[PDB]
Amino acid sequence: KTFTEVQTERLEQADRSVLIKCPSKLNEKKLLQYLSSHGKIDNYFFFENRGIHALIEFSEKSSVASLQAVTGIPKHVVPYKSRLFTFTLKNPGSQAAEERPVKISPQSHIPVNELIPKLCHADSISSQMYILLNEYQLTEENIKLRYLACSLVRDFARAYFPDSTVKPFGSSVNTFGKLGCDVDMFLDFHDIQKHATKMKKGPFEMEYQMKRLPSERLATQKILSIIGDCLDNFGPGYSSVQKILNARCPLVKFSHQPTGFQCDLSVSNSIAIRCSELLYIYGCLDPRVRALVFSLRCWARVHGLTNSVPGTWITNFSLTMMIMFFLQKRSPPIIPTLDQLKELADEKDKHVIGGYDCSFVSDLSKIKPTKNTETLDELLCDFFQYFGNFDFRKNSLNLRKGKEVNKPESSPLYIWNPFEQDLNISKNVNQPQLEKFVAMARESAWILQKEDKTQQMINKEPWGLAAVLIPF
Amino acid sequence: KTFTEVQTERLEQADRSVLIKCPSKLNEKKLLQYLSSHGKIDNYFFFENRGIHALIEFSEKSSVASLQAVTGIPKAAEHHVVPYKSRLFTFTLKNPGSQAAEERPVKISPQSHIPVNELIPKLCHADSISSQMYILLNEYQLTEENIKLRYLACSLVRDFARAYFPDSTVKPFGSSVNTFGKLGCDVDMFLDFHDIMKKGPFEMEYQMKRLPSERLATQKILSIIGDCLDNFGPGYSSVQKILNARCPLVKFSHQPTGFQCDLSVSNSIAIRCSELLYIYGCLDPRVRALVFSLRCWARVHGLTNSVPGTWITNFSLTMMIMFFLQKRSPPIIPTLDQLKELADEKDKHVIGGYDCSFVSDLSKIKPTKNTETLDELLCDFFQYFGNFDFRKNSLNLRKGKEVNKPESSPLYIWNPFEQDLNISKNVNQPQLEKFVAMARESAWILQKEDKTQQMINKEPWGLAAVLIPF
Ligand SMILES: [Cl-]
Ligand SMILES: [Cl-]
Ligand SMILES: [Cl-]
Ligand SMILES: [Cl-]
């Protein structure tokens, strides 16, 4: 039910899953028939990534060890044994060419130039936005692949750090991730002995000889450094390992070839996890939330408002928060404020970080459904109108209050960090970039207000969402 | 027990051993009583190294995992440690106010030998040169406890390598295992880390990352282990990575044991050399007595040094001593070719095309009929090399003969396991001449002294007379 319960279930399924690089001439039935001899298979799919790969989700974890028991070491290699397998035929020239294999599950979304025609063939702006959402959103197969990537990194980390867990956060889990997005991973340490340890009969407290480091930051940097070097030199399918240990949140970036994901590994950050669960709640509350976010992120990218590299540009996160604020301010609100979510929280949902109460309700059924019935056609235009006429000089965005309030500090765009006091999430944004955003918003509002959609359809020209998803 | 069988047994015992940093107020009985609840303990001892530490050797390996299952990270330590779990434990009292046993002193096992200034008086009170040399040997040689500690150090380093090379081994060589090591000597360690089912309709293999060329692989693996030694455990390690040397090397101080260590990738020739020396050391007690005394002599007179350079090495010196013993009438030890001829098929070892075989079973070697005393052998060693023609002759330990020098080098000692290689190529003419001068002077001192009067006069005599600066 809850965000935490979804993560637990996803990780358990990943724990009994494996990846297989398939033979050039793949017979699906023969492969599955063989794998089923090691135990029942709950789920599986194929994907393309420099050849065909299969994700296999066994019903029982024991099946993994069963398969590993008949798997050999190639024959010079780093003999780290994993859940990455390569299957080939003994006598490849004695099997014929295969007629109709296999269904491929896409791990990327269609490019904008292919999307636009689909949008133009839609009946309304609402339908356009749902088409975009369906084309872009993470698939069940992609999600399974993301959790398996985390599970594999966990196993790699567990060689030196047996209590390691690796769990995804951000776009991979908050409902706003699009196909192709990075897998952001958090490493944490928790006792694998989940069972109830007795009262020991002896007199001693017993610990490992470990250096007590002055800061959590230094420990984090040393741990990530070793894991990074090990992935680089010893880990199968890990490439382009970049150590970015001196960043605000120390980080190791890498490309995971078996899955084709770009990944980012850091040590667990409690604030970042609260943020992911908050966005998950908002995304789950109403489908218009996700529809708006996906369309507006695409809009921002198309018009050069967002960028892949950090700088003076508004970030996708900042933009997403602006959208949440917009939705909080509808009459009636489409989503509750963070203070409203805090007040619905019981003792079990108490989360205090750095002295600041970051509590909010985890049970979605405790949130009264919105009575707002505005269509996406209205909301898209109104978003552009609202921020196109928003006084950014005088007002800041407070998502806890759901109100425009005086700016604590002078900054072009001030959006309050909802889990840290006196922090602006959009402090990076300069006046030029903010003015560009405003100009694009106003132009987009005008285009939607003035267009004759029926004639554009007849004239075979872009209309509605498509009209604002092309350069001006 | 062959050399190989000794190593195997030692490593197996180290594999089921742990190190425990003991409570400030240590009750030995309570500690052992508690630890025995995880399984029987075959051996244990205590040593001093910034507080009391205990080596615990469990009867069963399973006991290690049992102890680890109740070992925890403090709440205050969370997020502030590198969570590498090891066989290094710290024990403290749950309630410091719950001591309810009589306090007894704990026996400390020494890991160092007495300094020369304390040794000399003991030598001067001996009855003969032979007795002096056996006193030195007994004061200096590795103890059973020290040996266990050395193998455990290797075992701990092995566990770092095994994270991604599960079949890895780390084994000591050189002075730690060849019978000629003295307390306080480095632990020289070799890593061997790579190249060590039902049939379905698919061939099935793991996806594994390729290693680079042997040297590059060696450099990367040693670099990571060096980083582990830095960051895993209590640390304070003084890790020196010397990865660009001819033989890539990591030097470090292992704080839990207090050993100075050198880690490199396994060299098959160096291992044969260690077993050869082990054979020679085991054959006759005079072999070890001579080597220990002469190594001490070399150090005292500045002929050997802790850092590599133009100095004769302890290994080269030891080989010179072996050559000397091969040349006695009759020989005290056999030549390497004699040991080769005694080898059966099971003792076959060919390295780089060169037959490095020799007998491993010591009972197959006929005991020496030489009955020369150490008094004679010590003086004769100095006399022999003091008059040896180093310009014209080289030392061949396979033949047990002086032979023409293959290449021009001040001191030429044939590498017994590699063709056309001089183990003492590093030695320059100045250092060789110093050695010769010291040898000749030492011979004269022993030849001319009146030992009875020196004893009465309370002056150094015999071995003591050559173990002080000239
Ligand atoms: Cl194949
Ligand atoms: Cl997030
Ligand atoms: Cl996008
Ligand atoms: Cl040796």
Numbering used by the authors:
A (entry chain B): 52 to 126, 131 to 527
B (entry chain A): 52 to 247, 254 to 527
Sentences from the paper on this structure:
In mitochondria, mRNAs are polyadenylated by mtPAP. In our work, we purified an active form of chicken mtPAP and determined the crystal structures of the mature wild-type (WT) enzyme (residues 37–568) alone and in complex with ATPγS, UTP, GTP and CTP substrates to 1.82–3.1 Å resolution. The purified mtPAP crystallized as a dimer as observed in solution. mtPAP consisted of an N-terminal domain (NTD: 52–194 aa) and (using the domain nomenclature of the DNA Pol β family) of palm (195–341 aa) and fingers (342–527 aa) domains. The palm domain is composed of three α-helices (α6–α8) and a mixed five-stranded β-sheet core (β5–β6–β8–β9–β10) that forms one wall of the active site and harbors the catalytic triad conserved in all members of the Pol β family: D237, located at the base of β6; D239 on strand β6; and D319, which belongs to β10.
We crystallized mature (37–568 aa) chicken mtPAP and solved its structure to a resolution of 1.82 Å. We were able to model residues 52–527 of the protein, and only two short loop regions were poorly defined (molecule A, Mol-A: 248–253 aa; molecule B, Mol-B: 127–130 aa). The crystal structure revealed a tight symmetric dimer featuring an extensive (7260 Å2) area buried upon assembly. The Cα RMSD between the two chains is 0.9 Å. Loop Lα3–β4 (121–138 aa) from the NTD extends across the central axis of one dimer toward the second molecule and forms a hook, and the insertion Iβ6–α7 of one palm domain of the second molecule loops onto this hook. Here, the Iβ6–α7 of a palm domain of one protomer in the dimer complements an additional β-strand (β7) on the far side of the four-stranded β-sheet core of the NTD next to β4 of the other protomer. The loop Lα14–β13 (462–485 aa) is well resolved and harbors N472 (human counterpart: N478), whose mutation to Asp is implicated in SPAX4. Chicken mtPAP is structurally similar to human mtPAP (Cα RMSD 1.42 Å). However, due to the higher resolution of our data, major deviations in the assignment of the NTD regions, as compared to the human model, were observed.
